Amino acid sequence: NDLTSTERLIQLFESWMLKHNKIYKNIDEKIYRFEIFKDNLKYIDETNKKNNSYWLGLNVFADMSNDEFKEKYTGSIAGNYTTTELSYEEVLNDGDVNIPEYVDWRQKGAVTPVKNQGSCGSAWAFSAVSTIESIIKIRTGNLNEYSEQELLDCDRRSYGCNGGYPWSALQLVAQYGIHYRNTYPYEGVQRYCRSREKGPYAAKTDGVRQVQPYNEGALLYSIANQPVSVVLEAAGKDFQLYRGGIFVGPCGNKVDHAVAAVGYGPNYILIRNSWGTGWGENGYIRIKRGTGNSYGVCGLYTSSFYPVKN
Numbered sequence: 001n002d003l004t005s006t007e008r009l010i011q012l013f014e015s016w017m018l019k020h021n022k023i024y025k026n027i028d029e030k031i032y033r034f035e036i037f038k039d040n041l042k043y044i045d046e047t048n049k050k051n052n053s054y055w056l057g058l059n060v061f062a063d064m065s066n067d068e069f070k071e072k073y074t075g076s077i078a079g080n081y082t083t084t085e086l087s088y089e090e091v092l093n094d095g096d097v098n099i100p101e102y103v104d105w106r107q108k109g110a111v112t113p114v115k116n117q118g119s120c121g122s123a124w125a126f127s128a129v130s131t132i133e134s135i136i137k138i139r140t141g142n143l144n145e146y147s148e149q150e151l152l153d154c155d156r157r158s159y160g161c162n163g164g165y166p167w168s169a170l171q172l173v174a175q176y177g178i179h180y181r182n183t184y185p186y187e188g189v190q191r192y193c194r195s196r197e198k199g200p201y202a203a204k205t206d207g208v209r210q211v212q213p214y215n216e217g218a219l220l221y222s223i224a225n226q227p228v229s230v231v232l233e234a235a236g237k238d239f240q241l242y243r244g245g246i247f248v249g250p251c252g253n254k255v256d257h258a259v260a261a262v263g264y265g266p267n268y269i270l271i272r273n274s275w276g277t278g279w280g281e282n283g284y285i286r287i288k289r290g291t292g293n294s295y296g297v298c299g300l301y302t303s304s305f306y307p308v309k310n
């Protein structure tokens with residue numbers, strides 16, 4: 001409503017709480033949150049003055065300091081970095097790809113509604129699960145919602161809400177299967193495996209493949225075929241408060257979050273996050289491509305997997 005009076009800010013903060021359905025513990029938290037809000041406000045304003053290709057805004061995270069945001073919503077990957085795979089049959093190659101100028105699997109009805117992970121380092125399950133929903137639509141024609149909680153609960157190579165691996169989750173689904181979200185809904189806490197209580201799996205895939213890492217072109221090819229699980233560095237302020245446009249940085253290559261790549265255009269790769277529709281462009285972000293950065297911006301080309309289904 002305006003920055004030129006504390007009075008007007010408090011009002012702004014109030015209507016922002018109402019917009020993001022935000023209820024607090026007590027008024028001691030409310031005042032505290034306002035300070036943080038008001039701090040993030042100055043930063044957003046100072047930054048949307050510069051003329052970048054993207055801008056920030058008072059999204060769902062306007063409430064939180066970067067430190068708190070890091071801890072709660074990042075580090076689904078963090079963990080401790082593999083060393084790249086078993087060293088057997090995965091990587092694909094190249095030769096002569098001819099892909100569309102643009103791709104967006106939403107427009108083929110292959111993508112479910114944006115999910116919210118809450119404060120869990122579970123993004124590795126959502127990233128996986130959404131590329132599974134897609135691949136199945138793409139092959140059988142139906143779009144279904146499958147269970148992130150099941151992976152949370154059941155994947156022994158991963159660490160529940162303290163991070164995990166997308167490739168592991170993909171691979172569980174190829175060897176065992178997965179249940180519908182409604183049979184096994186999301187609680188945002190890890191519990192015991194309840195796969196046996198649920199009867200038959202709803203679906204099973206056939207395998208998983210890694211895409212050649214540090215290779216922009218190999219990832220575009222893959223996206224033109226299906227959504228792909230990818231990882232990136234999402235702990236920065238500019239990322240937290242991202243509202244729209246083509247994200248360009250700054251970010252490092254210390255990946256800590258897993259998301260899904262549902263498309264691309266000439267200058268960007270389109271990415272589905274799991275922080276709900278109150279973040280980004282209704283839950284998505286366009287990340288800049290074509291810079292000849294081997295890593296990709298935010299280390300996007302670091303570690304990419306997708307499910308296989310005949």
Ligand SMILES: [Cl-]
Pocket residue numbers: 180181182183
């Ligand atoms: Cl169900």
